[PDB]
Amino acid sequence: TTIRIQHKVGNKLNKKLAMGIPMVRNLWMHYVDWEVELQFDEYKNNAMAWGTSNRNLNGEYMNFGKSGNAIKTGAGIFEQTEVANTMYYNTFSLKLLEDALYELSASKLAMDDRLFVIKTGERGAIQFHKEVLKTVSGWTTFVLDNNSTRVVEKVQSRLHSNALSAGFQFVEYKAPNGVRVRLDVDPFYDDPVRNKILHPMGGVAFSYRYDIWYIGTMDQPNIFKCKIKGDNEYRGYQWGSAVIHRMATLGVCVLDPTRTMSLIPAILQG
Amino acid sequence: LQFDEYKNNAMAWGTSNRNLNGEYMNFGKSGNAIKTGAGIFEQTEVANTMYYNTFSLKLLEDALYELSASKLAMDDRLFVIKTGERGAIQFHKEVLKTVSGWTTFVLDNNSTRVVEKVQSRLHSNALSAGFQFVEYKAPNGVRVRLDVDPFYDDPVRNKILHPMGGVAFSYRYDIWYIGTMDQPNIFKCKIKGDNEYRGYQWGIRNPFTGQKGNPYMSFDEDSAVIHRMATLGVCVLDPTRTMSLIPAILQG
Amino acid sequence: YNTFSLKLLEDALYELSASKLAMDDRLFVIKTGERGAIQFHKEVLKTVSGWTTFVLDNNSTRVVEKVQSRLHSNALSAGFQFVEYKAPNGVRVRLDVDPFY
Amino acid sequence: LDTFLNSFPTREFEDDNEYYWDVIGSSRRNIPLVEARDENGVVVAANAANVGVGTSPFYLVFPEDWFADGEVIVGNLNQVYPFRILGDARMEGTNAVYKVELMGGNTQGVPAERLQQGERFSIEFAPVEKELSRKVGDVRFTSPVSMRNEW
Amino acid sequence: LMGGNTQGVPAERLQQGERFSIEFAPVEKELSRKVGDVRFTSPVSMRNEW
Amino acid sequence: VDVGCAPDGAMQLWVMEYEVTGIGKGCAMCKAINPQQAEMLLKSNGIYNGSSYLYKVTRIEQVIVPPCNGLMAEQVVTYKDV
Amino acid sequence: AMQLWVMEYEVTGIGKGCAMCKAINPQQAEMLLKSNGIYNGSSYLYKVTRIEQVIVPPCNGLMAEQVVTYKDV
Amino acid sequence: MKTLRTLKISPNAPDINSVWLYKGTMKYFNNGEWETIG
Amino acid sequence: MKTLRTLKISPNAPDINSVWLYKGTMKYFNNGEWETIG
Amino acid sequence: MKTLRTLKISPNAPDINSVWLYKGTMKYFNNGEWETIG
Amino acid sequence: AGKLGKFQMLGFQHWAPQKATNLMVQLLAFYRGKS
Amino acid sequence: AVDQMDNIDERYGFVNQ
Amino acid sequence: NQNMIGDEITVRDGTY
Ligand SMILES: [Mg+2]
Ligand SMILES: [Mg+2]
C-alpha cells in the first residue's frame, strides 16, 4: 500500500490548530519539520496495524484515486489476524477463555508448548484479575491462606512495630493438561483518540481486548513488516505556496493467521 | 521569630484577595490596594478537589487510578499520603474493613503476626497483641502509603475538632507528588537580589544596635522602631499532579 | 474507674501520648498487682477475640503445647496469658506487677 | 510548618509582578459528528437505510475543518467502516462538510445508526495510487494556555 | 474580610468562644505604613517542704 | 459569573456520593456555597431527611463549567455496587 | 454552549444515574450523555427521566438525588 | 457446592461470600440476589 | 460443644458437620436429623 | 462489620463471637443480648 | 462508576510578564497521544 | 521522546524563539 | 521614602 502526506508551509503553525483548556477551580513556535515527520510516521503506523483491503474476489480494486488509477490498499495487522480464532464476547469468562485455548492447544500444540501470553490493555488486566478471583473463590475445596499467598505482608513502618500491607493481583492462570495463560499489558490499547466507545467499568473498551500473538514456535516469524530494499520513503518541497510532500510505500504480512487468537468485546462489532 | 512566623503562615496559608472582576478590595493605610496571592494550600486544591464525611478507600484508589491509568509508568505509581495521626487510624480501619471482605483468603496469625509471643515472669506462654495497616497495594501498580506529619496535628492553628478525637486537620490526606514531572512542581518564589528589608527609626539612642548618639535624628522622642519587610510567594505548576482529600467539617 | 476496659485505658494512653510524646517514646510500663494483671489479661483477651478478621492459629500462639508424659504418646498442655498490647501510632503497653500492690 | 516548607526548592524571579507558565495538551483529537447527508443532501436519520450501498458518495458534517483532502477517517467503530474523504471541505458557515465514500471493501453501506450526531471521528492515514499520485492529507498542531500566580 | 470575600462572614462564625489566631500582616506595595507587633511570655515556680 | 452567591461571588456545583446505611447508595447533584452546605442539603432536603443520620457522604467534588458544550460530570450507582 | 442541564436517568437493568451537561436545549443534553457517557456502546440503555435547567439565584439548592436501595435490586 | 465460612453483622450488605445478619433476619447471596432465610 | 465452621448451599444434604442452606431454609444436624431453623 | 466465623451447637451460650444453635433457633449476640432469627 | 470532566479540547477558531518555568507543562488532566 | 506508557511528548514539536 | 528596592516597593513610616 502507498501513503502520502502534504502540508502547505519555516517554523510556524497553520490553520489546523486546537487548544487544550483544563478545568481548574477558578476558571511557542511550531517546528513544522517535527510534525510532518511524526504525523507521517503515524500514517504509516495506522496503515500497518489498522489498514483495510478494497479488493473484490474478482481481483478488482474498488476505490479510484485522483488520477483515475485504482487506490491499491492491503490489509493490516489487525485485519489479517482477525480471519481465524477471533471471538466477540458480551461477558468475559474463564469458562470461555480456557475452553477456547484448550481446544486449539489439544489439536495443534504439544503439552510443553502451551504458554499463552495474553496481550491486552490496562483495564483488561483488572478484568482478568477479577475473573480469576471469582474462579478461585469457587474453589471451596482448598482453603487459601496468607501464609502462602501473602496478600497481607509485613512492611516496616515508624507508626507500629507490627505494621501490615495489603493487596494482590492475579496475573497468571494455569489450566489442566498444561495450558498456561499469562498476562502482560500493551499501553497502546488505552488510546483515547482512536478508541472512542467507552466501557462501563472504566477505560475505552479496547483495553478489554485480549490478543494471543505467537501461538507455538514456527522456526520463523509469523507476522512481520514488509519493506522495499534501499529507500522507499520520498520527500519533496513544492515552492510556489510552499508545500512539503512525503510519500511512502509499505506492507504487513501475516503468514499463518490461525496462530493468533483474539478476544474482542462484542460492543466493538457491527 | 514573629517575622519568620509571618513568612511561613503566608506561604502555606494564603488566599488571593483578587475579586471575580479582577479587582482588589482591601485597601491599606495609605489607600492603595493590598495585593496578596494564593498559598501552598490554595494553589493545590484547584484541580483534585475532594471532600468527605465517611472515608472510603475504594474512592481513594479509584481516583488515583483514573488519573494515573496510562499516564504514569507501572513503577511510577507509588502515592505517599501525608496526613496526621488520626488520619492514619482512619486509614487503618478502612484497610481493615477491606481485608475483612476478602473472604476468599484466610488471614492467619502465622504470617500477619497480630498475636506475638513475648517473655514474661507472669506465664510460661505469655502473649502480646497489636497491628496497624499502613499500606494498601491497588491493582496494576498503584501503591498507597502513609506519611504521618506532625504539621497536621497542630492544635493551635487547627481549632475545628473532629467527633472521633483530635483536630479535623489530622483527617486530611494530601498526595503532593504524583509521578515525576521533569521539573520541580512545588517551589517557593523569591525575587533575585531582594534582601529582606531592615530599618531603624530612632531618636537620641538605639537600643537595638546599641548606639548612643545620633548624627541624623528621626524624631525627638527617646525611642527606636524596627521595621522588617519581605516579599514572598509560592508556586504549584501542575495542580493535577496533586490530590487532596479534606474533611468537609472544615467547610472547604 | 468503676469497671476496667481496654477501650478506657487505650484511649487514656493515646490521647495522652498523641498530645505529649513522640512516636518512638510511647512505651508505657504499667505497675500493678497480681489481680490487676488478670484484669488486664481478660480485656486484651476480649479485644483479640473480637478480631475475627484474622484466624489465630495455634502454630503462632502455641496456647496448646506438646509436652512429654507417661500417660500418652501425643500428650498436650493448655494455657496462655496476654501481658502486652500494642495500640496504633506507636503506643505499647507492658505490665510490671509488684508484690507491694 | 517550617519543616514542611523546607522540602520545597526556591526559584528566584526578576520582578515582583505576576508570573505565568504555559500548560499544553495533545495534538491528536477526535471530532464529533454533527449530521450526515446522503448524495442528494437529505440528512441520514436513525430510522433510515444504509448509506454507502454501492461505494456511493455521501456527506459527513463536522463542527470544524479538521480533516483533509484524501484521508481515511473512521467512526466510533474503527476500521469496520473506513471513510475516504473526497475533496476539500465545503464550509457551511462554521461547519465543514466532506464528500465521503466507503473504503474497506464495503459493498453494503454503513448503517444509519453509525452516522448520528455525537459520534467521534479520527484520522488514520491518507492512501494514494501506485501510478500518477497526487497530494493528500494535512498536519495538525496544538496551542498552550497559561496559568498565573502573584506575590 | 480578605481573600476576595464579597458576601461576608456568617453570624454563627462570630460567637462567644470562637478562637482567633494570628496569620500574618500583609501590606500594600506603595507607601505602606507600619503594622504587626511582638509578644512575650514568662514562666512560673513550685515549692516543697519537709 | 458574579451572580452574587456566597463563596467569593461565584456559583459552585457539586457531585455527592453517599451510602444510606441499611438502605443502599446513591448519587447527588447540588449547587452549594460550601461542601459543608452540600452535605447539609442532603440531611435537610434529601429523600431521607427525616432519618438524616443515615447519610454517610463519601465524596463531595466540585464541577467546573467548561468553555463550551459537552458532558460535564456523570455518576452511575449500579446494582452490583449495592 | 448556553445553559447547564442536570439529568436524572436510569440505565435499564444496570442501575440509576446522575449527569450534568452544557447544551443549548435539553435535546442536545441527552445527545451529549448517550454519545459521551460511560454506556457509549450500549446507548439505548439510557432512560432519561428528568431534565431541569441550572438557574442560579437560589445559589444553594439540590438539583438531583437518586438512591439505589436494597429492594430495588 | 458453595461454602460460606463467615457470618457478618452489618446494616449494609456484606461481600457475597458472607452471611448477612441484621437484627433478626438472615440473608445469603444466591443466584445474584440476597435471599431471605425465613 | 459441636463447632460448625462452614455453611453450605446445596440442593441435597451435605455432611453432618456443615450447615445446609437451600432457598430460605437453614438446616443443621441436631439429634441425628436435619433440624430446620425457623 | 462483625464477623462470626464459628457456629456452636450447645444448650449454653457459647461466646460473643460465635453463633448459638439450639434446637430450632439461631441466636447471635446483638445489642448486648441474644437475638433469635426467624 | 462515573467520570468528571477535567479538560476540554477546543479549536482556535472557537476562540510580557516573567515566567515561572521556561519549559512547558503537560498536565495530568490531559490525555496524551500514543505511539 | 515517547514515554514508557507509549505516550508521545508534545513539547519536542516547539521552538522557543 | 526608604524604598526597599526589590523591583519597586516603597516604605513610608517617617525618616529613618
Ligand atoms: Mg487469527
Ligand atoms: Mg491539586
Residue numbers in the entry:
A (entry chain D): 203 to 211, 213 to 230, 243 to 455, 475 to 504
B (entry chain C): 253 to 504
C (entry chain B): 304 to 404
D (entry chain C): 52 to 202
E (entry chain B): 153 to 202
F (entry chain g): 21 to 102
G (entry chain h): 30 to 102
H (entry chain i), I (entry chain j), J (entry chain k): 1 to 38
Wording from the paper:
Virus ΦcrAss001 (Kehishuvirus primarius) was the first representative of this order to be isolated in pure culture from human faecal samples. Here, we present the characterization of ΦcrAss001 using cryo-electron microscopy (cryo-EM), enabling de novo structure building and elucidation of functions for around 1,440 protein subunits constituting the virion, leading to the identification of a novel ‘crass fold’ in the distal part of the tail. The virion possesses a short non-contractile tail extending approximately 44 nm from an icosahedral capsid. The extended tail barrel formed by widely conserved paralogous ring proteins has a high capacity for storage of cargo proteins alongside the capsid cargo zone, ensuring that the proteins required for the initial stages of crassvirus infection are carried inside virions and delivered to the host cell.
